[PDB]
Amino acid sequence: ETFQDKVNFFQRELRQVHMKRPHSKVTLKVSRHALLESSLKATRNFSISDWSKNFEVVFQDEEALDWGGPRREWFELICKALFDTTNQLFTRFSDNNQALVHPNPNRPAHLRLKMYEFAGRLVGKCLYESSLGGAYKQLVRARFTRSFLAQIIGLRMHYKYFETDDPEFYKSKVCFILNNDMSEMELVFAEEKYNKSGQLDKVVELMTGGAQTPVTNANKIFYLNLLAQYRLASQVKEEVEHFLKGLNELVPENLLAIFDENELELLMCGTGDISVSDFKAHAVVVGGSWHFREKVMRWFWTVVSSLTQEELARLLQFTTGSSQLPPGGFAALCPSFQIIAAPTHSTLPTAHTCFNQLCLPTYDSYEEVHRMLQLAIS
């Protein structure tokens, strides 16, 4: 039912999964300047039960008053090294800074597949540590694509993931196919790759015989879903398999099945630092009657200030695709956050994540705005 019930149930399982894996102490000698490399060396001989142990992280030539400080910094720093795209272990589909991150099929060859196993164990360690109690919380610092989260849960790929994971591709190709006739496009169930000299390098079929299968109006939805499967899952099959192999050593895959993609983000990354003042200061209201701009919007901000931290997180997922702002906050959004006045009355709010944008109808009372905004994020 509720998200907190899922978390409470999930965390209690996990404490039972690790019940004869003691939280005894283990030392991790790492270096700030070569953090990912030294962390892999420090854990290279860890057994499965060793990953359940209390991590005592020693930063080289650094003294600390307690172990909690270095541990929390190590978790945050190792999350950034793994998932912030800099080392190309993960990548983004557009060279933007809001873009969600995805496993990289075309990474530098020195990043071997066992590094995705480490990343999976690290994420599982965050979930395990956080299930020990509030004082042991370790949040995953990453803004994952929805399709990668869907692959963690074991869901099939769908073209809807393009809007959040590759907004430019969704706005160009996907939206065109969804809205237009295909009889003259001469598309087939295959992808063409060209070299840097503009020559056809390779043809990759979306299924057996796909190059001889035309895309028609009657099958174009199956084409888009098979396109999502190829572009978001098939090309990273081994990377995801090794990630899941590491994750499932600490978190059995059956346990994550009770969450959907967005709930999995909240479980891993938390409800975030959603500042309503930063929200209001960077959101542009587009159009609308006087009643909307001067009364409905005032009701809106009062509602937003009354939302629980989870509801705030779901509002950002509803409108931007992730519960976490980009590094720069609300100012760092692809197109700046816009609240569009919908030309409807007393209807449900809608959103277009590839434009961020929240589409807000006009309402007749505060409690109507309260009711409808909670429904739209429910």
Task: Give me the secondary-structure topology.
Blueprint: H1 3-17, E1 25-30, H2 35-42, E2 54-59, H3 68-83, E3 90-92, E4 101-103, H4 114-131, H5 146-153, H6 161-165, H7 167-179, E5 190-194, E6 200-205, H8 220-232, H9 237-250, H10 253-256, H11 261-269, H12 276-282, E7 284-286, H13 290-306, H14 309-320, E8 338-345, E9 350-351, E10 358-362, H15 366-376
Parallel strand pairs: 1-2, 7-8, 8-10
Antiparallel strand pairs: 3-4, 5-6, 9-10
Write a compact overview of the structure shown:
This is Apoptosis-resistant E3 ubiquitin protein ligase 1. The protein is of the alpha/beta class and 378 residues long.
Textual characterization of the structure:
Residues 47-378 form the HECT domain. The active site is at residue 354. This is Apoptosis-resistant E3 ubiquitin protein ligase 1. By secondary structure, this protein is α/β, with parallel strands linked by helices. Among the domains are: 160-234, Hect, E3 ligase catalytic domain (2-Layer Sandwich), CATH 3.30.2160.10; 276-377, Hect, E3 ligase catalytic domain (Hect, E3 ligase catalytic fold, 2-Layer Sandwich), CATH 3.30.2410. Helices cover 45% and strands 12% of the residues. It has helices at residues 3-17, 35-42, 68-83, 114-131, 146-153, 161-165, 167-179, 220-232, 237-250, 253-256, 261-269, 276-282, 290-306, 309-320, 366-376; strands at residues 25-30, 54-59, 90-92, 101-103, 190-194, 200-205, 284-286, 338-345, 350-351, 358-362. The strands form four sheets. It has a four-stranded mixed β-sheet with strand order 7-8-10-9. A two-stranded parallel ribbon has the order 1-2. Helix 1 crosses helix 4 (114-131) and helix 3 packs across helix 4. It is globular. It starts with a helix and ends with a helix.
